[PDB]
Each structure stands twice: as C-alpha cells, then as structure tokens.
Amino acid sequence: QDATVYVGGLDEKVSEPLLWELFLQAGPVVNTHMPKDRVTGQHQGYGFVEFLSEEDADYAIKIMNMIKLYGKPIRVNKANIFIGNLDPEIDEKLLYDTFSAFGVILQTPKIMRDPDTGNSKGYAFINFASFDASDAAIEAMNGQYLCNRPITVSYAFKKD
Amino acid sequence: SAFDLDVVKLTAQFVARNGRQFLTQLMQKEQRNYQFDFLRPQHSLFNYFTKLVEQYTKILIPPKGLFSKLKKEAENPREVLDQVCYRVEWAKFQERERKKEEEEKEKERVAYAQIDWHDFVVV
Amino acid sequence: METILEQQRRYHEEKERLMDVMAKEMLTKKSTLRDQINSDHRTRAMQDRYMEVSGNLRDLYDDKDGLRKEELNAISGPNEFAEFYNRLKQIKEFHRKHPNEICVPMSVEFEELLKARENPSEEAQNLVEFTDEEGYGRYLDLHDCYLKYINLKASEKLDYITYLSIFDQLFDIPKERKNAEYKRYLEMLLEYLQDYTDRVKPLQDQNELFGKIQAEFEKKWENGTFPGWEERAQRLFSTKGKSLESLDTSLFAKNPKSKGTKRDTERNKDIAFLEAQIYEYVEILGEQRHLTHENVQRKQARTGEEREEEEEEIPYWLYKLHGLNINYNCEICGNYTYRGPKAFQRHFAEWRHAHGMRCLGIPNTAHFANVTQIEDAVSLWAKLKLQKASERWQPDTEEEYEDSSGNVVNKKTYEDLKRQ
C-alpha cells in the first residue's frame, strides 16, 4: 500500500497499460490494477499503480496531482450537507478551507472512500454551523466551478 | 518549536517595557538587520505574540506583585470560591446567551424558508 | 532568569488555570456523596496549591524594586536583547515540537472518564480518611467511644441510646466528675470530633475557624460566658460560683485559681479547651449527630436480615473422492491443520504459511515447498544457503607491498595495506 499509488479521476480513454505508460516517466511502475464494476463491467475511475520503490510513488503523487488526463481530474495519492461529483485531488483540510469562505465549519469534514481502494468514492458529507451557511452553500457552492469537476451540494435530510 | 516560543517570549518581554506605541525595543531591531517575522500581523503567531504582550503588560500591574501584595486570592479560600462561583455563573449566562442566539438563528431560518419568493416587485 | 517577568506570568497563569479548574468543578453537577466529597477534597488541594503558588510569587519582589530602574529605562534596550538573541542562536538540530507549554497544566488540572480525579490528586482516596460506618460524612462512628465510656465507667448499665443522650448535652450537668479520668476520654472524643468536622467540609477554612474558636474561648469563655439571674457567674475550671463580677475578677487572679489546685487554669486549661472544642463541634455538627442517632435507632429496630441488607449496601462419496476426511499438520505455518492432498500442497503456498516462514527466519524458497518440519526447515535453510558457489566476488588482490611474493590479501587486506 505504501509503494502503490491510488489514482482517481480516470475517464473512458484511460486504460490499464495507459496509466502504466504515463507513470513510467515518474518511476518504475511494476503493475497496474483497475477494478471493474458489476453492472457496467468497466472501470469506475479509480485505479492503482504498484511501483517498485516508495520514492517513485511519492514522486508520482507529487507530480501527477490534479492533472487533466483524458478530460478528467486525475490525481495520485498514497494508498447536514452532501457534496457529489467532487475531485479526488482535494483533501479534508482543502475541503475545510474551501468551505470556510462561505460559512463557518463545525468540525473537520469527512469524505467517503471505497472499501477496496480507499482513496475516494465520489461523495462527501460536511456539516455547517447554522442553516445560513447551508443555504449559502446550496445557493453558491451548489454549482460552482471546482478543479475540473462540477460539484453538486444538496441537503442530506429535510423535513416538509 | 521551543526556540520560536522563546523568541516570542523575549519579544513580548522587550516590547512591554516601552514608553510609546511605536518607540519600542523591537521597532529599532527591525532596522538593525534582525529578521523577525512575528512582528507582522499577517502571521498566525502574531495573535499569540499579542496575547503574550498583554500578559507581560498585566504582569506589570501594581496589584500584579510589583509594589503590592494580594491578600484575598492568597489568604482567603472563601473569596476564591466566590470568584469560582461567579465565573461558573458567567459561563452559564454565556451558555444561555449562546442557546438564545442559536434559537434566534433557528427561528430566522424557519422564517426564511417559509416566505414567498415568487412575489417580486421592482420599484 | 526573568523572575519578575516570566515567573510572575507563569504563576498568574497557574493561578488562572487553578481558578478555571475550580469553576469547572463547581459548575458540574454531583450525583453521589462520596464523589462530591472527593471533588471537594480535590478543590481544597487545588486551592492549597494556588495559595502556595501565590505565596511563592508574592515573595519575588525584593530584586524587582532594584531592577525596575534598569528595566523601564529607554536608554537601554536592544543591546542586551541582541546579546540574549545571540545566546539563543545555538544549534537548532533538535527537531522536536513541544506543545505542552500551556496544554500540560490544562491536562494536569483535569480528570478522566474512567476516574474523576486530577493528576496531582491521582493517589487520593476517600477510604483512607473516612471509615465505612461514617459514610463519607453522612454519619459518625460512636461505637468505640461508647466502649471507652463503658470501660471508664466500669458499668454495663449504659447502652448506645444512653450514651447518645449523655453526649447530646452542651451546657447541662455532666454525667461524671470534671476532675475524674473521664476528661482523658473527652479529649480523645474532641480530637476525633475535630477530625470529623475537618473531614466533613474540606473546602472550609479550618485555620480561620480554629482561630475564631480560640478567640471565643479566650475573650468570652474565660470571662464568664454563662451569666445568671453562685448562680450569677460560673467558672469552668474552678467549678465554683461567684457573688458578683468584681468578686470573680478578684478570684480570677487568686492563688488557688492560678496553680494552687488540681483543676486550676495552669493544668486544666487544655481539658477546658478540649471541652469547648467538643461543644463547638456538637453545636456545629448537630444534624450529623441526629442522623447518626436515627441510623443507630433504625439499625437497632431492624431484624437480622434487615441489618445484613443494610450492611451489605453432505456429499460423503464426493468427500471420499475429492480427498476429504484428511488433514496435514503444517508446523512451520503456525502448526495449522489443513485439508487433504489438494490443500496439502496449497498449504505450502499461502498467506499463513508464508507469514509463519517469515517469522521463523527462513526465507520463502521454492525448494522448501514440500517441507513440513522445524529441524528439517533449519537444515534446509542452512545447507541450501549461499554455498561455496558464488563466493564474495572471488577476492584476489595481491597488493604491491612486495611486488614479487604475497597475494593472499583479499579485497580488504590490500586496501588497508595500501591506504596507510
């Protein structure tokens, strides 16, 4: 897990030897793994590249971070408001700093991860201090231009 | 982080003995080729340096132990218990004020989510 | 050292942290009497520590009056500051962050969820200062005092209710003589009552209460504290009456009243002070004595069981064909028990067997696949180790120390011979 780098944000043009060919300049990528879905039978955008040394994986994570690969925000990492279609290049501290401009955050946010890879699932949950920050996130942040990924902010629970 | 904290404590001790706002022992040190990034207010350590300077100024008070001796806080446990009870009452009043502010914010959020947003009038 | 600047601010921060801990202890609600007594003892210990810190900080003002002339001088300044900065310009190779400058006194004055006790008060226990019969200040133990009174009176006609009725008197006639041996038991009963009063309220000032009791004993009890309408003025030491105040003032400095008797003011002053302290403890803790008497009456009126309850509180053919009903003991693989021949070979190439081999020390080699033993595993790891083939690069240096003989110097011998 230390020598392997988890890549997120892969489109349909990216393939299993294509990621190994793109990561060959960063370091000696020994193997590439792409988990296939059960309903569609294709990649879900997240994969793994197992290299030989941990320094090559660190250089690939520091070089290929927030890159625009196949029209997709590909990024390598070390393997009541709901935000969907978020970029995997952002972290919890980066999401807390991005959410601090609209309103005040009550605590540190959390992002959902896949049970197989564990880098990024695609959705996240963040809680605001009051309902005014949630309304400002649903008015402004729900549709704002993020890092090559259109996010969507919505209410997790609402009572009619 | 011990050397930076010691430098901040030395700057707070040297700046508290000044007779003016700008005529201090640290303003002339900035022009004497001494790098001090904690003097600018843009850094996060400046908020702690201001609290250290405030504590150094409060350590120079006449009831702080320079020319007088405290008798109520040092020789009366009942006065300390009354001060602790007053601090607990002030904390309870602050918690009640925060609960009232949260209730007012919830009432404003309930009133804003129930008003009609289709009756537009441009005058 | 900055004793007037840094040490005074540190003492003020410690006093503020102690006051914040006392306010957090007083703001929290209580549910039990023993936990409340432990919190009161911890608050009393924190108040004593804050008073000691204030007394230590209040004495650091002798050199401050001499150093204030040099500290407030605007002619000085950045010279000594630059000298201190050059003294603080040492090697910064100690890459270690210390966030416990103010967080450590905050954590020392706090408690945990498993045990509600502070870090200086971690060794404190309520069972070392109070007995089980007292109930952490709920009642008072009077069985030993009643046994001592029955041993001193030499009679079995005094029960616990009679002893409680005799001990309830404050200014009435005593049960025995004042010059008898009952004063030695009364002094012990007063010394126990003083400790019971000091244990029932640790947050109260015991020294101020003792000084007030001494002032009331000296200024009031020694000057006729019980006026009448021999009955006008009574003396506690001499145990005699007086006609008027002038006769009592003339007899207060008399020769039998000073030292010419066995109950004078010279020898029987401590017994009178102990009796006054016992009377003050009975007047201050009368509700606890009434609760102890009610508990004794409830224990006497109960039965034996009530007193004990109060004191206690499928394919078999396929199995035979595929190779079932058989196992294999992989000792190197954690001594696991595998299946038949199908799992036999599988047991040599797996995660558990690999972890066991790695923990045993032998590397996972293909030749050691069919091996399943300890001694045999070590023999394989030794004999199948790096044999004579592929030696250490075939070292043959033959340095030029002689140029005509000597070549046994290896790659390191000739190097050391040619270096020096």
Short mmCIF file of C-alpha atoms in Angstrom, two decimals, chain C residues 55-410:
data_model
loop_
_atom_site.label_atom_id
_atom_site.label_comp_id
_atom_site.label_asym_id
_atom_site.label_seq_id
_atom_site.Cartn_x
_atom_site.Cartn_y
_atom_site.Cartn_z
CA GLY C 55 2.82 32.88 48.48
CA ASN C 56 5.83 31.89 46.37
CA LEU C 57 5.08 34.60 43.79
CA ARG C 58 4.43 37.28 46.43
CA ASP C 59 7.98 36.92 47.82
CA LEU C 60 9.66 37.58 44.44
CA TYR C 61 9.56 41.37 44.77
CA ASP C 62 12.81 42.27 46.57
CA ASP C 63 15.05 42.45 43.49
CA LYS C 64 12.19 43.78 41.33
CA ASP C 65 12.31 47.19 43.02
CA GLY C 66 16.01 47.40 42.17
CA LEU C 67 15.62 46.04 38.64
CA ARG C 68 12.68 48.31 37.72
CA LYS C 69 15.09 51.24 37.30
CA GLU C 70 17.03 49.32 34.63
CA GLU C 71 14.01 47.61 33.05
CA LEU C 72 11.99 50.81 32.49
CA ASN C 73 14.98 52.76 31.13
CA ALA C 74 14.53 53.76 27.49
CA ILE C 75 18.27 54.43 27.04
CA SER C 76 18.95 50.68 27.23
CA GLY C 77 17.16 48.04 25.20
CA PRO C 78 18.31 46.22 22.05
CA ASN C 79 21.93 45.74 23.17
CA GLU C 80 21.05 43.22 25.90
CA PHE C 81 18.25 41.92 23.66
CA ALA C 82 20.74 41.26 20.85
CA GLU C 83 23.08 39.61 23.37
CA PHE C 84 20.24 37.35 24.54
CA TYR C 85 19.33 36.60 20.91
CA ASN C 86 22.96 35.64 20.23
CA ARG C 87 22.77 33.46 23.34
CA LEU C 88 19.58 31.96 21.88
CA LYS C 89 21.30 31.47 18.49
CA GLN C 90 22.56 27.94 19.21
CA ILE C 91 22.15 24.82 17.04
CA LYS C 92 18.52 24.16 16.08
CA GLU C 93 19.11 20.48 15.21
CA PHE C 94 16.69 19.33 17.96
CA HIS C 95 13.76 18.78 15.59
CA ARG C 96 11.09 18.27 18.24
CA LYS C 97 7.91 20.28 18.83
CA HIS C 98 6.75 20.85 22.41
CA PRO C 99 3.07 21.90 22.57
CA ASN C 100 2.92 21.20 26.34
CA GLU C 101 3.84 24.74 27.43
CA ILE C 102 0.24 25.56 28.36
CA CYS C 103 -1.60 22.32 27.49
CA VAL C 104 0.18 20.32 30.23
CA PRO C 105 -1.14 22.45 33.16
CA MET C 106 -4.56 22.28 31.48
CA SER C 107 -4.38 18.47 31.33
CA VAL C 108 -2.90 18.18 34.84
CA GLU C 109 -5.91 20.04 36.30
CA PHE C 110 -8.43 17.77 34.53
CA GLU C 111 -9.93 14.33 35.12
CA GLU C 112 -10.59 11.24 33.02
CA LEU C 113 -13.80 9.40 32.17
CA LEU C 114 -12.77 6.21 33.99
CA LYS C 115 -11.64 8.04 37.16
CA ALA C 116 -12.80 11.54 38.15
CA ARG C 117 -9.53 12.63 39.75
CA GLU C 118 -6.87 15.19 38.88
CA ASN C 119 -3.23 14.42 38.09
CA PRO C 120 -1.82 15.73 41.42
CA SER C 121 -4.84 14.11 43.14
CA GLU C 122 -4.46 10.72 41.42
CA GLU C 123 -3.30 8.99 44.63
CA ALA C 124 -6.09 10.45 46.79
CA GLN C 125 -8.72 8.05 48.14
CA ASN C 126 -11.82 8.60 50.27
CA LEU C 127 -11.33 5.27 52.08
CA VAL C 128 -8.04 6.43 53.66
CA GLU C 129 -9.62 9.37 55.55
CA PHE C 130 -13.08 8.05 56.49
CA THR C 131 -14.41 4.71 57.71
CA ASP C 132 -17.16 2.59 56.19
CA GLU C 133 -19.56 3.29 59.07
CA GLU C 134 -19.28 7.07 58.64
CA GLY C 135 -20.44 7.05 55.02
CA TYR C 136 -18.05 9.82 53.83
CA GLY C 137 -19.53 12.38 56.21
CA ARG C 138 -23.08 11.01 56.37
CA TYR C 139 -22.79 9.64 59.92
CA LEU C 140 -20.28 9.44 62.78
CA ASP C 141 -18.75 6.34 64.36
CA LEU C 142 -19.55 6.26 68.09
CA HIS C 143 -19.17 2.56 68.96
CA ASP C 144 -15.54 2.89 70.08
CA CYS C 145 -16.35 6.00 72.14
CA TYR C 146 -19.26 4.17 73.78
CA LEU C 147 -16.99 1.19 74.51
CA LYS C 148 -14.38 3.52 76.03
CA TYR C 149 -17.07 5.21 78.14
CA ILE C 150 -18.36 1.82 79.32
CA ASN C 151 -14.80 0.76 80.18
CA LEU C 152 -14.15 4.02 82.07
CA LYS C 153 -17.48 3.96 83.94
CA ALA C 154 -16.98 0.24 84.84
CA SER C 155 -20.70 -0.48 84.49
CA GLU C 156 -22.89 -2.24 81.92
CA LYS C 157 -25.97 -0.06 82.61
CA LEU C 158 -25.27 2.33 79.70
CA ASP C 159 -26.46 1.45 76.19
CA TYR C 160 -25.90 3.34 72.93
CA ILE C 161 -29.07 5.42 73.38
CA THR C 162 -27.98 6.46 76.89
CA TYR C 163 -24.53 7.41 75.57
CA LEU C 164 -26.15 9.40 72.75
CA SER C 165 -28.38 11.18 75.27
CA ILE C 166 -25.41 11.93 77.54
CA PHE C 167 -23.36 13.20 74.58
CA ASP C 168 -26.22 15.44 73.38
CA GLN C 169 -25.84 17.82 76.34
CA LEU C 170 -23.90 21.04 75.80
CA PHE C 171 -24.26 23.19 78.94
CA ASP C 172 -26.11 20.81 81.29
CA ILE C 173 -24.72 18.88 84.26
CA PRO C 174 -22.06 16.28 83.34
CA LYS C 175 -22.51 12.57 83.91
CA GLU C 176 -19.23 12.20 85.84
CA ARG C 177 -16.86 14.44 87.79
CA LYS C 178 -14.84 17.08 85.96
CA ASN C 179 -11.66 16.14 87.86
CA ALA C 180 -12.01 12.40 87.21
CA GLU C 181 -10.48 10.27 84.44
CA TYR C 182 -13.38 10.97 82.05
CA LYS C 183 -11.58 14.09 80.79
CA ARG C 184 -8.92 11.92 79.14
CA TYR C 185 -11.65 10.18 77.14
CA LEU C 186 -13.42 13.50 76.46
CA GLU C 187 -10.21 14.95 74.99
CA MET C 188 -9.94 11.97 72.62
CA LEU C 189 -13.62 12.33 71.70
CA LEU C 190 -13.00 16.03 70.99
CA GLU C 191 -9.92 15.23 68.88
CA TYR C 192 -11.99 12.72 66.90
CA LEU C 193 -14.84 15.22 66.52
CA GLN C 194 -12.44 17.88 65.23
CA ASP C 195 -11.13 15.48 62.58
CA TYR C 196 -14.71 14.52 61.69
CA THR C 197 -15.62 18.20 61.30
CA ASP C 198 -12.49 18.83 59.21
CA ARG C 199 -13.30 15.81 57.02
CA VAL C 200 -16.98 16.74 56.54
CA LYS C 201 -16.05 20.09 54.93
CA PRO C 202 -12.58 20.21 53.36
CA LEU C 203 -13.36 23.37 51.35
CA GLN C 204 -13.91 25.45 54.51
CA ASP C 205 -11.10 27.39 56.18
CA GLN C 206 -10.09 25.25 59.15
CA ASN C 207 -7.39 27.67 60.36
CA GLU C 208 -9.78 30.64 60.45
CA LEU C 209 -12.39 28.53 62.26
CA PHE C 210 -9.76 27.39 64.78
CA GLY C 211 -8.68 31.00 65.32
CA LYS C 212 -12.29 32.08 65.81
CA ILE C 213 -12.83 29.22 68.29
CA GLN C 214 -9.66 30.24 70.16
CA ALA C 215 -10.81 33.87 70.24
CA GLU C 216 -14.24 32.81 71.54
CA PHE C 217 -12.56 30.62 74.18
CA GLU C 218 -10.16 33.36 75.30
CA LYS C 219 -12.26 36.53 75.13
CA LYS C 220 -15.68 35.09 76.06
CA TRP C 221 -15.38 31.66 77.72
CA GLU C 222 -12.61 32.80 80.08
CA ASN C 223 -14.62 35.86 81.21
CA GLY C 224 -17.95 34.36 82.28
CA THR C 225 -19.70 33.19 79.12
CA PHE C 226 -22.75 31.94 81.09
CA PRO C 227 -24.38 34.78 83.07
CA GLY C 228 -27.21 34.16 85.50
CA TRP C 229 -30.08 35.99 87.15
CA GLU C 230 -23.25 31.44 92.97
CA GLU C 231 -25.63 31.25 90.01
CA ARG C 232 -24.73 34.71 88.66
CA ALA C 233 -21.25 33.68 87.45
CA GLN C 234 -19.85 30.18 86.98
CA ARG C 235 -16.24 29.19 86.29
CA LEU C 236 -15.47 26.24 84.01
CA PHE C 237 -12.06 25.46 85.54
CA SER C 238 -12.62 26.10 89.26
CA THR C 239 -16.23 24.74 89.12
CA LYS C 240 -17.43 27.28 91.68
CA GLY C 241 -19.86 30.18 91.77
CA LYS C 242 -19.36 33.89 92.31
CA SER C 243 -21.30 36.65 94.05
CA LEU C 244 -20.64 39.46 91.55
CA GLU C 245 -18.34 40.37 88.68
CA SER C 246 -15.84 42.15 90.95
CA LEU C 247 -15.52 39.08 93.19
CA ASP C 248 -14.97 36.90 90.12
CA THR C 249 -12.34 39.34 88.81
CA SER C 250 -10.60 39.29 92.20
CA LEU C 251 -10.75 35.48 92.37
CA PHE C 252 -9.54 35.05 88.77
CA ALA C 253 -6.02 36.08 89.83
CA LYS C 254 -6.17 34.15 93.12
CA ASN C 255 -3.53 31.65 94.26
CA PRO C 256 -5.78 28.51 94.32
CA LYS C 257 -7.24 29.57 90.95
CA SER C 258 -3.87 30.05 89.22
CA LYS C 259 -1.88 26.97 90.27
CA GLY C 260 -2.94 26.06 93.82
CA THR C 261 -5.43 23.36 92.83
CA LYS C 262 -5.75 20.25 90.68
CA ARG C 263 -8.26 21.88 88.29
CA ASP C 264 -6.74 25.36 88.03
CA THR C 265 -6.04 27.43 84.92
CA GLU C 266 -2.45 26.14 84.67
CA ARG C 267 -3.02 22.38 84.36
CA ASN C 268 -6.72 22.06 83.43
CA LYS C 269 -6.63 24.65 80.64
CA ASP C 270 -6.16 22.05 77.89
CA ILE C 271 -9.09 19.98 79.19
CA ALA C 272 -11.29 23.09 79.21
CA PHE C 273 -10.15 23.94 75.67
CA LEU C 274 -10.94 20.38 74.55
CA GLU C 275 -14.38 20.60 76.20
CA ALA C 276 -15.03 23.92 74.44
CA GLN C 277 -13.93 22.39 71.12
CA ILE C 278 -16.22 19.40 71.73
CA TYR C 279 -19.11 21.76 72.50
CA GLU C 280 -18.39 23.74 69.32
CA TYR C 281 -18.24 20.53 67.28
CA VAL C 282 -21.52 19.34 68.80
CA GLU C 283 -23.17 22.69 68.07
CA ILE C 284 -21.82 22.85 64.51
CA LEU C 285 -22.47 19.17 63.62
CA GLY C 286 -25.75 18.55 65.45
CA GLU C 287 -27.53 17.45 62.28
CA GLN C 288 -24.91 14.78 61.61
CA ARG C 289 -25.24 13.56 65.21
CA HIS C 290 -29.03 13.43 64.82
CA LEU C 291 -28.64 11.49 61.56
CA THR C 292 -26.23 9.07 63.27
CA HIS C 293 -28.69 8.62 66.15
CA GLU C 294 -31.51 7.97 63.67
CA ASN C 295 -29.34 5.44 61.82
CA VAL C 296 -28.47 3.73 65.12
CA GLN C 297 -32.16 3.59 66.04
CA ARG C 298 -33.02 2.16 62.61
CA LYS C 299 -30.26 -0.45 62.99
CA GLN C 300 -31.45 -1.38 66.49
CA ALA C 301 -35.11 -1.59 65.47
CA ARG C 302 -34.35 -3.75 62.42
CA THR C 303 -34.09 -7.54 62.33
CA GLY C 304 -31.02 -9.61 61.46
CA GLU C 305 -31.74 -9.88 57.74
CA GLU C 306 -32.57 -6.16 57.51
CA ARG C 307 -29.31 -5.31 59.30
CA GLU C 308 -27.41 -7.62 56.93
CA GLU C 309 -29.05 -5.94 53.93
CA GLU C 310 -28.19 -2.52 55.36
CA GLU C 311 -24.57 -3.54 55.99
CA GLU C 312 -24.25 -5.12 52.52
CA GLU C 313 -25.17 -1.82 50.83
CA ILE C 314 -23.28 -33.77 2.74
CA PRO C 315 -21.60 -35.49 -0.25
CA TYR C 316 -19.77 -38.19 1.69
CA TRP C 317 -18.94 -40.01 -1.55
CA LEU C 318 -17.66 -36.75 -3.02
CA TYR C 319 -15.74 -36.23 0.23
CA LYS C 320 -14.06 -39.64 -0.13
CA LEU C 321 -13.35 -39.00 -3.83
CA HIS C 322 -12.04 -35.41 -3.83
CA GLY C 323 -9.87 -36.15 -0.79
CA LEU C 324 -11.89 -35.10 2.24
CA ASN C 325 -11.59 -36.68 5.70
CA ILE C 326 -7.84 -35.97 5.68
CA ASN C 327 -5.62 -33.21 7.04
CA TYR C 328 -1.99 -32.06 7.12
CA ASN C 329 -0.05 -30.61 10.06
CA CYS C 330 1.93 -27.57 8.89
CA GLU C 331 4.19 -26.90 11.87
CA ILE C 332 6.07 -24.03 10.21
CA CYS C 333 2.73 -22.49 9.15
CA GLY C 334 1.66 -21.82 12.72
CA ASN C 335 1.07 -25.55 13.31
CA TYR C 336 -2.07 -25.25 11.20
CA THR C 337 -4.26 -28.23 10.28
CA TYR C 338 -5.02 -28.21 6.50
CA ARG C 339 -7.33 -30.48 4.42
CA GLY C 340 -6.25 -33.42 2.18
CA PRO C 341 -3.62 -33.60 -0.63
CA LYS C 342 -5.44 -30.80 -2.56
CA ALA C 343 -4.85 -28.42 0.41
CA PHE C 344 -1.58 -30.23 1.35
CA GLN C 345 0.41 -28.54 -1.48
CA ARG C 346 -1.85 -25.43 -1.16
CA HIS C 347 -0.74 -25.16 2.50
CA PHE C 348 2.86 -24.62 1.35
CA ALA C 349 1.90 -21.63 -0.85
CA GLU C 350 -0.44 -19.44 1.19
CA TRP C 351 -0.52 -16.37 3.41
CA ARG C 352 -0.46 -18.13 6.79
CA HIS C 353 2.40 -20.45 5.82
CA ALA C 354 4.32 -17.53 4.30
CA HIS C 355 3.89 -15.47 7.47
CA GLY C 356 4.98 -18.42 9.60
CA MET C 357 8.08 -18.96 7.47
CA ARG C 358 8.93 -15.25 7.61
CA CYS C 359 8.53 -15.26 11.40
CA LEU C 360 10.66 -18.40 11.71
CA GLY C 361 13.55 -16.66 9.93
CA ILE C 362 13.94 -18.91 6.87
CA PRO C 363 13.26 -17.19 3.52
CA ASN C 364 10.37 -18.44 1.43
CA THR C 365 12.18 -20.55 -1.18
CA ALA C 366 10.72 -22.87 -3.79
CA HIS C 367 12.91 -25.76 -2.62
CA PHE C 368 11.27 -25.55 0.83
CA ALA C 369 7.77 -26.03 -0.61
CA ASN C 370 7.22 -29.71 0.22
CA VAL C 371 8.99 -29.35 3.59
CA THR C 372 6.79 -29.51 6.72
CA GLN C 373 9.00 -29.54 9.89
CA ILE C 374 11.25 -27.37 12.18
CA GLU C 375 14.70 -29.02 12.43
CA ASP C 376 14.32 -30.04 8.78
CA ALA C 377 13.46 -26.44 7.90
CA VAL C 378 16.59 -25.15 9.64
CA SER C 379 18.71 -27.82 7.95
CA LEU C 380 17.30 -26.79 4.58
CA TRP C 381 17.86 -23.08 5.26
CA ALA C 382 21.47 -23.87 6.26
CA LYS C 383 22.56 -26.45 3.68
CA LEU C 384 20.66 -24.71 0.86
CA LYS C 385 22.16 -21.36 1.88
CA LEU C 386 24.87 -19.49 -0.05
CA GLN C 387 27.31 -22.36 -0.57
CA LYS C 388 30.86 -22.14 -1.94
CA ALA C 389 29.44 -21.32 -5.38
CA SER C 390 29.10 -17.58 -6.00
CA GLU C 391 31.54 -16.52 -3.28
CA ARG C 392 32.40 -12.95 -2.26
CA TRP C 393 33.37 -11.87 -5.81
CA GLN C 394 36.43 -14.19 -5.72
CA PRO C 395 38.74 -11.78 -3.85
CA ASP C 396 42.34 -11.85 -5.07
CA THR C 397 44.14 -8.54 -4.51
CA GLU C 398 47.88 -9.31 -4.33
CA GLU C 399 48.96 -5.82 -3.31
CA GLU C 400 52.28 -4.27 -4.33
CA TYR C 401 53.78 -4.34 -0.82
CA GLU C 402 56.39 -6.82 -2.11
CA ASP C 403 55.95 -6.86 -5.93
CA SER C 404 57.35 -10.42 -6.10
CA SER C 405 55.52 -12.50 -3.46
CA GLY C 406 52.34 -12.38 -1.42
CA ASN C 407 48.86 -12.50 -2.95
CA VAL C 408 46.57 -13.82 -0.18
CA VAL C 409 45.42 -10.27 0.62
CA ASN C 410 41.69 -10.09 -0.05
#
